[PDB]
Every structure is written in structure tokens, then in C-alpha cells.
């Protein structure tokens, strides 16, 4: 899948979870600082992603991921 | 395609409220 599609889906999921508008979500943004997203919100994002698109992210992987582009790369790696 | 029962409640609200008030007042006054 292209980066744009993945970023759009993640933007929709994040907007549902936290409230950050899709435009603010860019691949270089960091969840912890740029977007200010805690770990629990991150596992919520992971659950939504698994239940909607089938991409599965364990908690240990969620610990490593720091930026939005980092998450996208992980999803592309699975593909 | 509004359901019949909520539409009926919404339309005749004032008569229903007055009927309830009158019945309760009668029961608690007699």
C-alpha cells in the first residue's frame, strides 16, 4: 500500500481516538511530543487498526514506534 | 419515515402532559 493511504487511515483513526485533525497528522510528527499521544491511546490506535485493516501491532512494537512515518514503515514491512 | 409512536408523542405533547397532571392531581387529592 502507498504511504498516502496508510497515513489517511491512521489520521482517521487518530481523529476518532484523540481528536487530532487529519491535516495536522504528517509522517514526521511524533506521537509523544508533536501529537501528545500517550501509550494507551497508541494501543487504542493499534486495536482499531487490527479490527479495521487486519494489521497487528504487539505492545513491544508499540513501545518502539515514535513517529507517524515510523508506524507506516512498520506496516509496509509487514507487506 | 418517522416511527408512529415517537411522532405521536411529539405531536400531542401538551395534551399528554395535561392528562398526566390531571390524573395525578385527582389521585393525590381525592
Amino acid at each position: 500500500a502507498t504511504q498516502e493511504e496508510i497515513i489517511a487511515g491512521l489520521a482517521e483513526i487518530i481523529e476518532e481516538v484523540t481528536g487530532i485533525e487529519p491535516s495536522e497528522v504528517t509522517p514526521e510528527k511524533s506521537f509523544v511530543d508533536d501529537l501528545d499521544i500517550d501509550s494507551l491511546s497508541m494501543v487504542e490506535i493499534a486495536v482499531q487498526t487490527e479490527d479495521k485493516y487486519g494489521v497487528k501491532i504487539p505492545d513491544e512494537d508499540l513501545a518502539g514506534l515514535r513517529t507517524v512515518g515510523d508506524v507506516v514503515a512498520y506496516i509496509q514491512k509487514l507487506e | 419515515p418517522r416511527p408512529r409512536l415517537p411522532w405521536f408523542l411529539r405531536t400531542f405533547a401538551v395534551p399528554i402532559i395535561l392528562a398526566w397532571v390531571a390524573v395525578v392531581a385527582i389521585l393525590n387529592t381525592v
Partner: protein, 193 residues
């Protein structure tokens, strides 16, 4: 002898009330949610909460206040606790069933985020209404009210928040038997921007 007869009748009526209430509530829940397992889970969680409610009331009165519970408090508390706990769990399960078409876990999360505040407010209001009966000069009525209030507090803060959604997550598709439910929907392709 009169009070001995009263005690025997109290035990008999307590057993009868518990059994009949359980059966009737189970039937109503099964009819409304169209699922056997959901009703069974609701009933079990309510009973388990009821045990702890009894324990809390017994402690608070007998050990702290010192006055043991009156012999007629128990069934009056039990019936109301069962009814209200079943109603709260029914509300949560109904919202879960409404929101489940988008997957089990997302449906559970959305149903919780929706109902939680309203159910919490209603439970707290009911509990504080029951606990306010302690201002009665008669102390049996105060005992009944405080027992029901403690039961509702524990139920709202534990059974609804954790136990029911956790059991739903564990059982998965079996939670809605005999209705057929997908654990997760068909994995959609990523949206085109």
C-alpha cells in the same frame, strides 16, 4: 416462639425470592437480547457483586456501628440489588450489540465511551438516594437503604466497568450465542486519499 417462626419464614422466603427473581430476570434478559449467554453472564456478574455487597454492609454495620442487621433486611436488599444491577448490565450489553457491526473490540470500546458517563451518573444517584434513608429514626430502614446503596456503588464501579466487558472480550463470538457474530469484519483496503 413467635420470633423463631419469623426466622424460619424469613429463610424460606429469602430462598424463594432469590430463585424466582433469578429466573424471571434471566428470562427477561434472554428475551430482550435474544442471546442466552449474555443473560447468563449478566445474572452471574450480578450475583457475584451481590455477595460483596452483603459483605460490605455486614462489616459497616455489625463491626463499625455495632448494631447487627435486622432479620428482614436481607431479602429486601437482595431483590432491589439484583434488579438494578441487571438493568445496568442490560443497558451496557444493548449498546454493545448496537455498536458491534464494526468488530467486537471497537464496538465494546465505543459502547463504553458512550454509555459510561450516563450509567455512572444514574448509578451514583440511585446509590445516594438509597443511602439517604439512614436519616430515618427507625434503623432497619436505614440498614436496608445503606445496603442497597453500597451494592449499587460496588456494582457500578466494578461489574459494569470491568467484569462485563472483560467477559465479553473473552467469550468473543460465544457471548451472543445463538446469534452469529463475526469476531472481526472483512479486512478493508486502506482508504484512497
Amino acid at each position: 416462639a413467635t420470633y423463631n417462626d419469623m426466622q424460619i419464614g424469613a429463610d424460606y422466603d429469602l430462598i424463594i425470592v432469590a430463585a424466582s427473581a433469578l429466573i424471571l430476570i434471566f428470562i427477561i434478559m434472554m428475551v430482550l437480547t435474544r442471546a442466552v449467554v449474555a443473560a447468563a453472564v449478566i445474572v452471574g456478574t450480578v450475583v457475584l457483586s451481590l455477595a460483596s455487597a452483603f459483605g460490605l454492609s455486614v462489616l459497616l454495620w455489625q463491626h463499625i456501628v455495632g448494631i447487627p442487621l435486622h432479620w428482614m433486611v436481607l431479602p429486601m436488599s437482595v431483590i432491589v440489588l439484583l434488579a438494578v444491577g441487571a438493568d445496568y448490565n442490560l443497558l451496557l450489553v444493548s449498546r454493545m450489540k448496537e455498536e458491534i457491526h464494526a468488530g467486537i473490540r471497537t464496538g465494546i470500546i465505543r459502547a463504553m465511551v458512550g454509555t459510561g458517563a450516563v450509567v455512572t451518573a444514574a448509578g451514583l444517584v440511585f446509590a445516594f438516594t438509597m443511602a439517604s434513608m439512614a436519616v430515618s429514626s427507625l434503623i432497619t430502614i436505614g440498614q436496608v437503604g445503606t445496603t442497597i446503596g453500597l451494592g449499587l456503588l460496588f456494582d457500578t464501579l466494578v461489574v459494569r466497568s470491568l467484569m462485563t466487558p472483560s467477559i465479553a472480550t473473552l467469550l468473543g463470538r460465544w457471548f451472543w450465542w445463538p446469534q452469529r457474530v463475526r469476531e472481526r469484519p472483512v479486512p478493508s483496503k486502506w482508504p484512497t486519499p
